[PDB]
Design a protein around this motif. Structure first.
Motif, PDB file in Angstrom:
ATOM      1  N   UNK A 149      48.760  30.438  45.638  1.00 27.75           N
ATOM      2  CA  UNK A 149      49.819  31.066  46.407  1.00 27.75           C
ATOM      3  C   UNK A 149      50.062  30.377  47.760  1.00 27.75           C
ATOM      4  N   UNK A 150      50.920  29.373  47.748  1.00 30.36           N
ATOM      5  CA  UNK A 150      51.235  28.596  48.930  1.00 30.36           C
ATOM      6  C   UNK A 150      52.498  29.134  49.628  1.00 30.36           C
ATOM      7  N   UNK A 151      52.825  28.653  50.841  1.00 31.10           N
ATOM      8  CA  UNK A 151      54.055  29.074  51.542  1.00 31.10           C
ATOM      9  C   UNK A 151      55.258  28.931  50.623  1.00 31.10           C
ATOM     10  N   UNK A 152      55.330  27.818  49.924  1.00 33.83           N
ATOM     11  CA  UNK A 152      56.418  27.543  49.000  1.00 33.83           C
ATOM     12  C   UNK A 152      56.447  28.606  47.902  1.00 33.83           C
ATOM     13  N   UNK A 153      55.319  28.845  47.230  1.00 39.12           N
ATOM     14  CA  UNK A 153      55.235  29.821  46.123  1.00 39.12           C
ATOM     15  C   UNK A 153      55.571  31.255  46.584  1.00 39.12           C
ATOM     16  N   UNK A 154      55.115  31.597  47.792  1.00 36.11           N
ATOM     17  CA  UNK A 154      55.341  32.906  48.395  1.00 36.11           C
ATOM     18  C   UNK A 154      56.825  33.155  48.682  1.00 36.11           C
ATOM     19  N   UNK A 172      59.730  40.022  35.966  1.00 35.53           N
ATOM     20  CA  UNK A 172      59.611  38.958  36.971  1.00 35.53           C
ATOM     21  C   UNK A 172      58.475  39.266  37.903  1.00 35.53           C
ATOM     22  N   UNK A 173      57.587  38.291  38.051  1.00 41.67           N
ATOM     23  CA  UNK A 173      56.337  38.523  38.780  1.00 41.67           C
ATOM     24  C   UNK A 173      56.475  38.759  40.286  1.00 41.67           C
ATOM     25  N   UNK A 174      57.577  38.279  40.863  1.00 39.58           N
ATOM     26  CA  UNK A 174      57.910  38.504  42.269  1.00 39.58           C
ATOM     27  C   UNK A 174      58.124  39.969  42.603  1.00 39.58           C
ATOM     28  N   UNK A 175      58.430  40.777  41.581  1.00 42.68           N
ATOM     29  CA  UNK A 175      58.473  42.245  41.715  1.00 42.68           C
ATOM     30  C   UNK A 175      57.218  42.880  42.370  1.00 42.68           C
ATOM     31  N   UNK A 176      56.046  42.285  42.130  1.00 45.97           N
ATOM     32  CA  UNK A 176      54.777  42.829  42.639  1.00 45.97           C
ATOM     33  C   UNK A 176      54.324  42.183  43.936  1.00 45.97           C
ATOM     34  N   UNK A 209      47.253  27.185  54.296  1.00 48.83           N
ATOM     35  CA  UNK A 209      48.489  27.238  53.536  1.00 48.83           C
ATOM     36  C   UNK A 209      48.340  27.934  52.185  1.00 48.83           C
ATOM     37  N   UNK A 210      47.264  28.707  52.032  1.00 46.37           N
ATOM     38  CA  UNK A 210      47.006  29.479  50.807  1.00 46.37           C
ATOM     39  C   UNK A 210      46.630  30.929  51.119  1.00 46.37           C
ATOM     40  N   UNK A 211      47.254  31.843  50.406  1.00 47.41           N
ATOM     41  CA  UNK A 211      46.824  33.195  50.481  1.00 47.41           C
ATOM     42  C   UNK A 211      45.799  33.429  49.377  1.00 47.41           C
ATOM     43  N   UNK A 212      44.604  33.811  49.802  1.00 49.54           N
ATOM     44  CA  UNK A 212      43.560  34.116  48.867  1.00 49.54           C
ATOM     45  C   UNK A 212      43.557  35.643  48.743  1.00 49.54           C
ATOM     46  N   UNK A 251      44.923  44.120  43.925  1.00 46.14           N
ATOM     47  CA  UNK A 251      44.236  43.283  42.954  1.00 46.14           C
ATOM     48  C   UNK A 251      45.091  43.016  41.716  1.00 46.14           C
ATOM     49  N   UNK A 252      45.713  44.066  41.175  1.00 45.28           N
ATOM     50  CA  UNK A 252      46.669  43.939  40.066  1.00 45.28           C
ATOM     51  C   UNK A 252      47.857  43.040  40.449  1.00 45.28           C
ATOM     52  N   UNK A 253      48.457  43.296  41.614  1.00 46.80           N
ATOM     53  CA  UNK A 253      49.480  42.419  42.179  1.00 46.80           C
ATOM     54  C   UNK A 253      49.001  40.959  42.305  1.00 46.80           C
ATOM     55  N   UNK A 254      47.894  40.732  43.023  1.00 50.78           N
ATOM     56  CA  UNK A 254      47.485  39.376  43.291  1.00 50.78           C
ATOM     57  C   UNK A 254      47.193  38.560  42.021  1.00 50.78           C
ATOM     58  N   UNK A 255      46.530  39.168  41.028  1.00 50.47           N
ATOM     59  CA  UNK A 255      46.377  38.573  39.690  1.00 50.47           C
ATOM     60  C   UNK A 255      47.712  38.193  39.037  1.00 50.47           C
ATOM     61  N   UNK A 256      48.761  38.961  39.324  1.00 49.20           N
ATOM     62  CA  UNK A 256      50.071  38.613  38.815  1.00 49.20           C
ATOM     63  C   UNK A 256      50.693  37.473  39.633  1.00 49.20           C
ATOM     64  N   UNK A 257      50.619  37.516  40.952  1.00 46.13           N
ATOM     65  CA  UNK A 257      51.369  36.546  41.731  1.00 46.13           C
ATOM     66  C   UNK A 257      50.717  35.175  41.664  1.00 46.13           C
ATOM     67  N   UNK A 258      49.391  35.141  41.516  1.00 40.44           N
ATOM     68  CA  UNK A 258      48.611  33.899  41.492  1.00 40.44           C
ATOM     69  C   UNK A 258      48.445  33.509  40.066  1.00 40.44           C
ATOM     70  N   UNK A 259      48.808  34.414  39.157  1.00 42.90           N
ATOM     71  CA  UNK A 259      48.791  34.111  37.730  1.00 42.90           C
ATOM     72  C   UNK A 259      47.360  34.006  37.164  1.00 42.90           C
ATOM     73  N   UNK A 260      46.611  35.095  37.233  1.00 36.87           N
ATOM     74  CA  UNK A 260      45.166  35.058  37.077  1.00 36.87           C
ATOM     75  C   UNK A 260      44.393  33.867  37.648  1.00 36.87           C
ATOM     76  N   UNK A 261      44.905  33.205  38.698  1.00 36.14           N
ATOM     77  CA  UNK A 261      44.164  32.132  39.399  1.00 36.14           C
ATOM     78  C   UNK A 261      44.711  30.740  39.125  1.00 36.14           C
ATOM     79  N   UNK A 262      45.595  30.698  38.137  1.00 33.78           N
ATOM     80  CA  UNK A 262      46.241  29.504  37.627  1.00 33.78           C
ATOM     81  C   UNK A 262      47.202  28.900  38.635  1.00 33.78           C
ATOM     82  N   UNK A 263      47.760  29.702  39.540  1.00 36.73           N
ATOM     83  CA  UNK A 263      48.748  29.226  40.529  1.00 36.73           C
ATOM     84  C   UNK A 263      48.230  29.505  41.929  1.00 36.73           C
TER      85      UNK A 263
END
Ligand SMILES: [Ca+2]
Ligand SMILES: [Ca+2]
Ligand SMILES: [Ca+2]
Length: 187
Positions: free
Chosen positions: A156-161, A176-180, A120-123, A142-154
């Motif tokens: 990325x679950x089904x809900x968050x996605x 808005x971070x969903x842009x990436x 249930x997590x996208x790594x 990599x630039x995208x994923x750092x934004x969507x996961x929030x440098x690792x702070x969040x």
């Protein structure tokens, strides 16, 4: 209606993720293509659970998109119809109502394609493994994923996605971070 920003976000997705055969319209043929593309990615058997499972969900999704954007009923969604749909579909999400069912259905479908290991997590690896296979450069993953996961702070679950999915299509905010969601945009 849609701003220059929104239009381009909606079109970018049409040209990249939906129009597999790259001919300028969406059809069942683009979906048989996706299924092939994702099987080649995850080495699923041509006839296993995942293959048929996925063929079912896309028949639903397609049936959804097309009884929705195919005004002229010829089994083909044009950019003209795509945009025309999205226009009203967007102003309707910013009036309180949620997305169309087929669109959530694709989102869960995409999520499941990403979440290879099924925790249930996208790594970061699962993410770049998918999105590189649609042409998005490794660095924009990599630039995208750092934004969507929030440098690792969040996580990325089904809900968050799902919430990032909606930001992508509907937000007119450049911050808005969903842009990436689909690879890093330079904004
Ligand atoms: Ca096509
Ligand atoms: Ca049509
Ligand atoms: Ca995972």
């Amino acid at each position: 209606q849609l701003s220059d920003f929104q239009r381009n976000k909606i079109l970018r997705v049409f040209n990249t993720f939906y129009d597999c055969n790259h001919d300028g319209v969406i059809e069942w043929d683009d979906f048989e293509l996706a299924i092939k593309k994702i099987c080649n990615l995850h080495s699923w058997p041509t006839d296993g659970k995942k293959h048929n499972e996925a063929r079912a969900d896309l028949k639903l999704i397609w049936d959804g998109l097309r009884k929705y954007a195919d005004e002229n009923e010829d089994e083909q969604v044009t950019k003209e119809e795509w945009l025309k749909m999205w226009a009203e579909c967007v102003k309707s999400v910013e009036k309180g109502e949620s997305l169309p069912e087929w669109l959530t259905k694709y989102m869960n479908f995409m999520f499941d394609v990403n979440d290879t290991s099924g925790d249930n997590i996208i790594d970061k690896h699962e993410y770049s493994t998918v999105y590189m296979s649609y042409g998005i450069p490794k660095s924009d993953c990599d630039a995208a994923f750092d934004t969507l996961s929030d440098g690792g702070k969040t996580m990325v679950t089904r809900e968050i996605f799902a919430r990032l999915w909606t930001e992508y299509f509907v937000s007119n905010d450049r911050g808005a971070k969903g842009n990436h969601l689909f690879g890093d945009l330079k904004l």
